[PDB]
Ligand binder design. Structure first.
Ligand SMILES: Nc1ncnc2c1ncn2[C@@H]1O[C@H](COP(=O)(O)OP(=O)(O)OP(=O)(O)O)[C@@H](O)[C@H]1O
Ligand SMILES: Nc1ncnc2c1ncn2[C@@H]1O[C@H](COP(=O)(O)OP(=O)(O)OP(=O)(O)O)[C@@H](O)[C@H]1O
Ligand SMILES: [Mg+2]
Ligand SMILES: [Mg+2]
Ligand SMILES: [Mg+2]
Ligand SMILES: [Mg+2]
Lengths: 687, 687
């Protein structure tokens, strides 16, 4: 490299979480929301290590085996670099936010700031409510924390000192059975709202915990947390020519998931060594010193002690009034009349759940097929699908038990399904089914009419309230038939197949996209209006970035709204002069995906479940649908228009990863998500 | 039979639940508590059928196989008789209580009593909150409710009528995911507190449920509930000479657990027949018509809408102040100083949980053995026992995975135990370990000192708050050593063993009891003061009743406080003239067991885990402990004195099963449980 043509996805990912941090620092956001963003940021980083980092550790491992020509370390250095720098800023924001809460009458204090009154209250509050959950785990020579030590739990490693004697015990912070934030009794004025972290309650009560059975001069506590790399799965979804000739010293070296362990900085070396030996911290395991408190991701649920000002005002999920028209007797009548497009969370996910429920008992419904990637806990969907089975409908449920986190859950989401009579199909070993689909076939006076749902986000009830996603509900046969083929394709991928409307990975994708970029390229070179506008969560695929580069260089206007990782570098003289790249991080996690191609003037609009990452094009089943109803197409365009006109949360993507905000010229101050909500609200007003 | 010498246990059991009904009718009790007693009564009856009745159905089955000489039917008739008569009174009380609630401004109404305003509210409240849980289960020819139809759940069988056409669907009352009582909006005055049963919400909204996909002239709903006889286990705990030569047509005829099914009376016959065929209602299955509402056991949790008057005033579980004396540094020091007796729920079960927790980490504790019959959900005890294992203590946990209801739970209460390093021991096939014990062995400057707990009730956290039970905590070696033998006995029952203090079923029991009754018998006949006073939950064993009869007839004063089944008939001229039998049913479920023998004047007092039923003497491991510390002995006697002086809740036991209340002469009006609470409160006052 001499002038980086692409950006490392990992670094770009860090730039993204950094954008999340910006929300915690954005004074325009409600105080407690900012505090909660510290939680999202942390949680994101945790996920980052468990997965993306772990994935990288293995990519370099595979590489080095026979020898790697890439500068792996130069990456890890940057990563570790940017991470520490952000960590510095995190503390700055944290302390800054603590102070601002103090000005708001909210005081988060520790055991060293207790009133000689609140201490008494805590000691009492501790016996009555916490002691029962706190049981000292004595670390002896034959004790092996290794096994029974909970993952990602924070432990207070205590140092029992008696003369020159030192014993060690562990205290599990029971964040599962008790609020991580206890409210203390206001010392003097009633102006107060003092709270304390559960960890610090234990620090203050250490004596009360051990005096009962131990003799000692002093008791010292040091926090610690253990983590484990994610099960090697995402890395074998790429080994083609590598794993067809892979060595057996690379299989035991690639599957060996290491263990991480962070501990409070002051932890005396002796203890750190004790813990090391107990946790078999080998060469590829990591020990990292990092502060008093861990699991900052609990702040995601930081309580709002003060007034409503400290929290965002709810944006009530709207009903798509169309479904409630008296003329329609049920979901189907509404969908058969006109295609329906819902944009969450602006809209309720309620409509889809209703339809599936209706589908489970409508006597005229013959079959239901549906994709389950990551569903909510005890999905109402799983429920309906089982009810449907009981009612005799033929129910097929494709389950991606090989998801990312909500995976072990989609395995039990099977014993009952099959037991009820649901024909289940599973994801082939290293090929995920990420498409968000479901197909309902019902009899309408003799004929079999199909209704299909193609979405950008999964069938997850909570998610549907934090993530922006589109849901297409249609009865249009051009699309309905193809969605039927996707399911048959999934059941029998041996039989050749072709799609004329739908983009289907890994059958259609690349060819179909290259084809569309190339078409804009041709038009531009012929002086015809052109353009490529993409709304994705990640843009990393080599062949596609190069294609977009080719488009810019060819005179094609490329507009990108990527919220996550973007390896494409915009504005490189003579390479991406015509590419404008922005990212929007706000209250709702932007998750929907759209592809817009000028197409000489007859705009093509696709909603997709696939980001522009190699895995989404060649190693997974994904689905993008064009929008055939010009009314919906326009609706999406309006929404896109709003997004690209954002001048409050929009950030530019540049090679410096600066995360500079988009300056608003003399153009309207616009906040996409809010304006979009107005727009959708605007559509749901009484006919 | 010509003059019944004994009473059928089952009939006596019905007399007992009848005593529970009396509490629902006792105007001296708070209105809502009375309503809740209707719940306990119902729940008791449900348990009665699933177990005791089922047990009886099999006892007659075994009998008739080769031929039975007993008058089985004359029993079933009485049972079915008394049951229906009580049912009549139930409705009387119910309606009576509905009216009294009306006078208290609480109105429980049905769909036929809605204001043309509240209806609107319900329809709306239904879409927004219930529809999602209510999914019509269409009953078609190939549908088989049999399988997926939930046990003990109430179903609204709906009749879809279109012309002379009739379809059927089932509606599951989702009492699990929604309050069974919804509050309605007060029609006019603000005096109201109108509520409605969830079942009736569905009755009112039937139309809203089906209009979407069904054409019909009328919709009719009829409630139904399905139940299943308890797994044949309690009956094979008695087949000795019978099952050593038992036939294989008696094994398939004894293990075949039938199915019960109650339905609303008006259920049109056609439907009743439909359901029959669907549920394979054979010859030994039962179909019973019985009212609009089922699962009256939900009233156990009937909400208190009005003022505190409608509910009992809490009797705060007291701390045994002795444990909190500054002189003691922990539980052990307290127990080594003096034996400790706790009487729940007057006392907290908290002390026992504390000790076990302390035991789990006290470095000087070497081992912990404990009995688990029926523990609370996610027992803190199971937890401590696992922590103890982690800390290296040798933990043995005898688990009676063959309990009555909390059984399938004591099976999972194993995978983690053993995984943590706990040596588990299970209950031999048809021999339950009902003893309430635990043994802690800890080092006290060189020597191994043992602490033991012998209780009358099990280690159940909730139970400890509704049941009266004693807990003996001692370090007295005379008792501590024997409790050690009990556990070794349980692990290796092949080695012969003897007990000099403890009564241990089925090794000591009968011989030990007969011995004590016979001793009182001897004394009386010699003009020496004598007496037998028993506090049990059931008295049914033939040999023991006959023994008590022998005692009365011999001039021995026999005082019995039996709360449940009592087959002994008191006051039979020339048979039980000296036996006074009473039963106390009140707010706390009397559950403790004590045996008092005058013994010439040097009173012997035993606390036991065994009732006087055959199963508790010869077919189960049970334990009774004498009280060696005269101070505790006296404490129990005082409590017994109080119990037998009750003149508010005490009921006489007679052959007519009249449940007549004990008249108070000019003797103090006394309510045991309240006076006992005062007495215990009286003991816990600052030294
Ligand atoms: N601004 C934000 N709002 C909500 N969650 C956010 C935000 N920034 C980061 N996150 C977190 O990042 C995680 C999400 O994204 P990803 O895009 O990896 O999700 P998925 O839900 O796994 O979708 P897909 O399966 O289609 O990749 C979220 O689940 C969320 O907790
Ligand atoms: N007044 C009451 N209050 C609470 N529960 C009651 C009452 N009357 C009857 N019961 C019920 O009847 C059932 C049982 O009593 P038993 O005396 O068989 O209980 P256990 O606590 O299971 O003891 P054992 O181990 O000897 O079987 C209980 O499980 C209880 O829920
Ligand atoms: Mg993703
Ligand atoms: Mg992602
Ligand atoms: Mg029992
Ligand atoms: Mg029982």
């Amino acid at each position: 490299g001499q002038e980086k043509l692409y950006i490392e996805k990992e670094l770009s990912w860090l730039s993204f979480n950094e954008r999340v941090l910006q929300e915690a620092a954005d004074k325009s956001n409600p105080l407690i929301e900012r505090m909660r963003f510290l939680g999202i940021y942390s949680n994101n980083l945790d996920e980052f290590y468990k997965v993306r980092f772990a994935e990288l550790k293995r990519r370099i491992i595979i590489s080095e085996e026979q020898g790697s020509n890439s500068h792996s370390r130069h990456l890890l250095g940057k990563i570790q670099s940017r991470v520490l720098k952000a960590d510095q800023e995190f503390d700055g924001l944290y302390n800054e936010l603590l102070l601002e809460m103090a000005r708001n009458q909210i005081f988060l204090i520790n055991e060293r700031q207790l009133s000689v009154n609140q201490q008494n209250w805590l000691r009492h509050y501790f016996k009555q409510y916490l002691r029962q959950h706190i049981t000292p785990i004595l670390i002896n020579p034959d004790t092996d924390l290794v096994q029974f030590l909970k993952d990602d739990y924070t432990y207070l490693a205590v140092e029992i000192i008696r003369g020159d004697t030192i014993r060690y015990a562990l205290l599990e912070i029971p964040s599962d059975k008790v609020p991580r934030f206890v409210n203390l009794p206001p010392e003097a004025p009633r102006r107060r709202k003092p709270m304390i972290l559960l960890d610090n309650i234990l620090r203050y009560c250490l004596d009360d915990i051990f005096k009962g059975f131990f003799d000692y001069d002093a008791l010292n506590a040091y926090s610690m947390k253990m983590t484990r790399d994610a099960e090697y799965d995402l890395v074998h979804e790429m080994e083609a020519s590598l794993m067809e000739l892979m060595s057996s010293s690379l299989k035991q070296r690639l599957t060996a998931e290491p263990v991480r362990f962070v501990y409070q900085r002051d932890m005396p070396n002796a203890l750190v060594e004790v813990l090391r030996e107990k946790l078999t911290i080998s060469r590829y395991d990591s020990i990292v010193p990092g502060g008093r408190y861990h699991n900052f991701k609990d702040f995601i649920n930081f309580p709002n002690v003060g007034k409503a000002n400290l929290v965002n005002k709810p944006l009530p999920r709207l009903r798509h009034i169309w479904f409630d028209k008296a003329q329609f007797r049920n979901g189907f009548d509404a969908i058969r009349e006109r295609d329906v497009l819902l944009y969450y969370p602006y809209h309720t996910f309620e409509h889809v759940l209703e339809l599936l429920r209706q589908a489970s008992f409508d006597p005229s419904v013959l079959a239901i097929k549906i994709n389950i990637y990551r569903v909510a806990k005890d999905s109402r969907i799983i429920d309906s699908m089982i009810h449907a089975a009981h009612n005799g409908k033929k129910v097929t449920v494709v389950v991606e038990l090989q998801a990312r986190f909500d995976e072990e859950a989609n395995i039990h989401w099977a014993k009952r399904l099959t037991e009820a009579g649901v024909h289940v199909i599973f994801s082939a070993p290293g090929l995920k089914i990420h498409a968000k689909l479901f197909l309902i076939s019902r009899k309408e006076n003799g004929e079999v009419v199909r209704y299909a749902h193609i979405g950008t986000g999964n069938f997850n009830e909570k998610t549907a309230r934090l993530y922006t996603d589109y849901s297409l509900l249609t009865a249009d046969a051009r699309i309905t038939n193809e969605v039927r083929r996707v399911f048959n394709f999934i059941e029998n991928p041996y039989r050749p197949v072709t799609f004329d409307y739908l983009m289907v990975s890994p059958q259609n994708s690349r060819r179909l996209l290259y084809e569309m970029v190339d078409r804009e390229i041709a038009n531009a070179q012929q002086g015809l209006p052109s353009g490529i506008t993409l709304k994705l969560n990640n843009l990393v695929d080599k062949g596609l970035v190069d294609r977009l580069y080719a488009a810019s260089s060819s005179g094609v206007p490329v507009n990108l709204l990527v919220r996550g990782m973007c390896s494409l570098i915009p504005n490189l003289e003579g390479i991406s002069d015509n590419i404008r790249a922005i990212s929007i991080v706000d209250r709702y996690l932007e998750h929907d995906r759209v592809y817009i191609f000028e197409n000489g003037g007859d705009k093509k609009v696709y909603l997709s479940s696939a980001d522009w990452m190699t895995r989404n094009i060649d190693y997974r089943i994904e689905v993008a649908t064009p929008l055939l109803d010009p009314r919906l197409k326009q609706r999406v365009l309006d929404i896109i228009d709003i997004l690209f006109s954002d001048t409050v949360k929009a950030r530019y993507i540049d090679k410096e990863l600066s995360n500079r905000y988009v300056p608003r010229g003399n153009r309207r101050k616009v906040r996409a998500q809010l304006a979009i909500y107005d727009y959708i609200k605007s559509l749901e007003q009484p006919e």
